[PDB]
Amino acid sequence: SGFRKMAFPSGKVEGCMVQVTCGTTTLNGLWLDDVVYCPRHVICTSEDMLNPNYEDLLIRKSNHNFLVQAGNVQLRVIGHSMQNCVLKLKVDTANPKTPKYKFVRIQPGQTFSVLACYNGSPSGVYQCAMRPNFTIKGSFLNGSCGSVGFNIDYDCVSFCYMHHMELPTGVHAGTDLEGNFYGPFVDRQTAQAAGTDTTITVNVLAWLYAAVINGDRWFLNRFTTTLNDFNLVAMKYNYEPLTQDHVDILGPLSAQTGIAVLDMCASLKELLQNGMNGRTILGSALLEDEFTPFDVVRQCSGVTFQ
Amino acid sequence: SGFRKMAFPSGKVEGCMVQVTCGTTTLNGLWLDDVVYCPRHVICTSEDMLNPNYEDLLIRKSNHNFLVQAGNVQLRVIGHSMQNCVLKLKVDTANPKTPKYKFVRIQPGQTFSVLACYNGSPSGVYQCAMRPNFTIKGSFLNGSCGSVGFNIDYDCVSFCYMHHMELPTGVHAGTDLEGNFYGPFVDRQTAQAAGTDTTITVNVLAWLYAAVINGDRWFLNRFTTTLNDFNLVAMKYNYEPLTQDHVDILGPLSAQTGIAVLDMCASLKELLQNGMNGRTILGSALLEDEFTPFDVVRQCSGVTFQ
Ligand SMILES: *CCC(=O)N(c1cncc(Cl)c1)c1cccc(-c2cccc(Cl)c2)c1
Ligand SMILES: *CCC(=O)N(c1cncc(Cl)c1)c1cccc(-c2cccc(Cl)c2)c1
């Protein structure tokens, strides 16, 4: 037992991280087969980043303007192209550590692991959720651009996130690996800001089931509620609506604990209206919304990856 | 910015995990050079685990009684020996993925990353602290024995923990990699229990500095306190004493924030006596004690590992 904010093993992604340098700008790239992926604003200088025309900026570049370092070994760039907000650097060497992979775009509410890196060198790994406002509450310093987010399914890495920027509230914005931003953000220096967020209701319910599996039961109660009447309370507390599909997804967890989904909704309702009254759930004094039903089943049942 | 519970990249340890089987017992082993390390109770059956004589049990075993699986490849055991509570299985093949490593024993209060595994297959990675009572609040299911904890310093893996067992409160006990238990626990099935814990004061202070670095300042105040007078309050709230050495270790963080250590102690005093009053610090409604001063400096400054 126990319940932790658990990341996927990072090895398969570590073998893909490289350093990309263009001018005085250095950031991280992702090396898969003979292509290196990185944020396109690598080609921008300080004054370029104000209001850039990336097509003009890139045509002015040569292959030799891009230095790629894989460890202490240099990769020769033989081609380059722009795909939306990412660069694709064609290198003469295919990465022998290329795992089986996919490029997938995730939904707000879904989680992933982030391998934070600097200068192509992995620093740490942690678990994040895509917020409803399409930001992530990451941990990123200067130089972390090009760090990627991902999930692993058996042996296949599904890349879902490339880090680009920090917004003024200290949260982070980026793209999928096709270079399409998550949310209404651009790779220019404007006054863009996050905009209002909500709590991921289905994930909170998943975590309450995690707690019951792990022995926390004080918040349970005999009452029940209708889906409609729960959603009336959810809206009042800035929680997003619960759907019949969310109820279905919570089915296995319900059946394992013997607590009907709508019964857990009644408990969440009471926790929202009364607070937690000095008690804790899975070591938290707040309702936690960054574990999915998938995450709870994986951790409380024990699936591995090879 | 941002602040996450960050683990070390796990790749270097993933390449060392193997499956060890003896009879019907299967658990994880750590393969370094030509030795596989694993919990000695791998040789125990259900009835053996009651009150075992491990020396008697082991002399009854042959090399061929130990099946080691490194992926889909079998390692031939050519020797075996007991070192305290771990087994050392001599195999005919040295692990070509052996990183530079050390076997280190950590102190309560120190943190480490755990690579949870099942059947020699890594499942997830997360960050833990050695509690003052020598347990860890892990996340472990049946089959996780032999999973290891570790830190990484540039390129060298310092192994500090091998998982052995779960205690009745759902916390976890294990050994260092020389097989010496952390705390007063044994690898037999007795009524052993955790025993009373405390909060890691210096770590809470480190995290308050993390918060100030990251823009949370509401808990600051003009007052100060003496080290003695703070420790009088710490004892009352089950916090462990703060030493002059802890104050020294907090020096860099103090100097970076401009907040004297004893001034932060005054703030912690007020937070202990008044609570948090519906506010949060770094996304937490509790005082968090599982980041060290080292951890805060690493994450808020940005050190990598190669
Ligand atoms: C781009 C690399 C990077 O990691 N940057 C960064 C990311 N997270 C946190 C911090 Cl503190 C910095 C970064 C550095 C400078 C400027 C930007 C930027 C500005 C405007 C638009 C974009 Cl897409 C990026 C990012
Ligand atoms: C030993 C492998 C293992 O992982 N075990 C376990 C660990 N963490 C959590 C759980 Cl739920 C199980 C384990 C399984 C059965 C018995 C023990 C045990 C009992 C008494 C002494 C010891 Cl050293 C181990 C451990």
Side-chain angles (χ1 to χ4, degrees), chain A residues 13-292:
Chain A
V13 180
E14 296 167 47
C16 302
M17 301 310 307
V18 301
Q19 180 159 33
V20 179
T21 297
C22 177
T24 53
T25 305
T26 289
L27 42 66
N28 303 283
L30 182 77
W31 182 23
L32 305 164
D33 302 309
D34 65 347
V35 176
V36 172
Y37 300 81
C38 75
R40 73 178 174 171
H41 60 58
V42 73
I43 73 194
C44 296
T45 47
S46 294
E47 62 266 41
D48 277 344
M49 258 332 287
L50 291 172
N51 206 345
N53 187 293
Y54 284 98
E55 292 94 353
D56 282 328
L57 292 193
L58 189 54
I59 194 44
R60 263 160 226 190
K61 289 276 155 222
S62 324
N63 288 341
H64 84 258
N65 289 153
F66 300 96
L67 329 175
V68 182
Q69 250 78 66
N72 46 23
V73 157
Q74 309 51 75
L75 299 188
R76 179 169 146 251
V77 169
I78 72 192
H80 62 277
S81 54
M82 194 156 42
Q83 173 161 311
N84 306 305
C85 293
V86 303
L87 264 186
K88 301 180 63 163
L89 297 188
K90 190 86 171 12
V91 301
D92 62 32
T93 309
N95 184 359
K97 295 164 189 239
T98 303
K100 316 191 226 283
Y101 70 96
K102 320 205 270 223
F103 286 174
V104 316
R105 191 181 173 90
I106 59 167
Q107 289 289 321
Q110 295 186 298
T111 53
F112 55 102
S113 308
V114 171
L115 178 64
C117 325
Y118 303 88
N119 304 293
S121 286
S123 170
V125 68
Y126 59 87
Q127 191 79 343
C128 283
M130 197 31 83
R131 301 306 311 171
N133 63 3
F134 285 107
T135 63
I136 71 165
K137 311 188 156 263
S139 171
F140 286 121
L141 307 164
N142 276 335
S144 60
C145 269
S147 308
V148 301
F150 64 92
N151 285 283
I152 315 292
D153 230 315
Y154 194 36
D155 62 341
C156 170
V157 182
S158 290
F159 292 101
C160 55
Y161 177 80
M162 192 170 267
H163 186 53
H164 290 244
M165 38 177 260
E166 176 168 311
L167 293 167
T169 50
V171 303
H172 302 104
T175 67
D176 65 26
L177 269 292
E178 322 271 23
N180 301 298
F181 260 93
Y182 285 104
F185 310 112
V186 294
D187 50 353
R188 319 175 252 129
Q189 180 144 1
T190 68
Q192 30 193 353
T196 64
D197 210 16
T198 45
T199 298
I200 310 153
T201 308
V202 60
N203 285 2
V204 175
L205 293 170
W207 169 81
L208 287 177
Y209 280 109
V212 174
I213 290 165
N214 274 269
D216 277 320
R217 320 185 38 99
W218 62 261
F219 50 84
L220 296 179
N221 63 55
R222 81 190 282 178
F223 333 104
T224 206
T225 191
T226 44
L227 188 50
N228 288 317
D229 266 358
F230 173 79
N231 276 318
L232 263 206
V233 152
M235 186 174 294
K236 169 142 100 63
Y237 289 92
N238 196 198
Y239 273 53
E240 65 190 347
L242 201 71
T243 68
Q244 185 54 43
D245 200 52
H246 295 147
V247 172
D248 295 341
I249 289 143
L250 293 170
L253 285 179
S254 189
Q256 190 196 343
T257 56
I259 294 160
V261 172
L262 288 302
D263 287 5
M264 198 68 87
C265 289
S267 289
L268 183 47
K269 169 145 38 172
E270 284 308 304
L271 284 168
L272 290 171
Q273 294 169 345
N274 310 335
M276 275 188 53
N277 196 42
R279 291 169 290 201
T280 59
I281 301 182
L282 285 174
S284 179
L286 319 90
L287 303 171
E288 161 87 38
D289 79 339
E290 288 211 353
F291 310 88
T292 71

Side-chain angles (χ1 to χ4, degrees), chain A residues 1-2 4 6-7 9-11 14 121 123-126 137-141 166 172 285-286 290 299 303-306, chain B residues 1-2 4 6-7 9-11 14 121 123-126 137-141 166 172 285-286 290 299 303-306:
Chain A
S1 76
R4 284 273 190 200
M6 206 174 267
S10 54
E14 296 167 47
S121 286
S123 170
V125 68
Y126 59 87
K137 311 188 156 263
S139 171
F140 286 121
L141 307 164
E166 176 168 311
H172 302 104
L286 319 90
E290 288 211 353
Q299 196 168 156
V303 173
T304 50
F305 315 93
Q306 273 261 126
Chain B
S1 76
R4 284 273 190 200
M6 206 174 267
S10 54
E14 296 167 47
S121 286
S123 170
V125 68
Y126 59 87
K137 311 188 156 263
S139 171
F140 286 121
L141 307 164
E166 176 168 311
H172 302 104
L286 319 90
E290 288 211 353
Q299 196 168 156
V303 173
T304 50
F305 315 93
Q306 273 261 126

Side-chain angles (χ1 to χ4, degrees), chain B residues 195-269:
Chain B
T196 64
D197 210 16
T198 45
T199 298
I200 310 153
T201 308
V202 60
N203 285 2
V204 175
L205 293 170
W207 169 81
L208 287 177
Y209 280 109
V212 174
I213 290 165
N214 274 269
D216 277 320
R217 320 185 38 99
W218 62 261
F219 50 84
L220 296 179
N221 63 55
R222 81 190 282 178
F223 333 104
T224 206
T225 191
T226 44
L227 188 50
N228 288 317
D229 266 358
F230 173 79
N231 276 318
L232 263 206
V233 152
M235 186 174 294
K236 169 142 100 63
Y237 289 92
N238 196 198
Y239 273 53
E240 65 190 347
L242 201 71
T243 68
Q244 185 54 43
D245 200 52
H246 295 147
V247 172
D248 295 341
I249 289 143
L250 293 170
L253 285 179
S254 189
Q256 190 196 343
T257 56
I259 294 160
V261 172
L262 288 302
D263 287 5
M264 198 68 87
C265 289
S267 289
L268 183 47
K269 169 145 38 172

Side-chain angles (χ1 to χ4, degrees), chain B residues 286-298:
Chain B
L286 319 90
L287 303 171
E288 161 87 38
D289 79 339
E290 288 211 353
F291 310 88
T292 71
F294 195 109
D295 297 342
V296 172
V297 173
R298 150 168 84 130

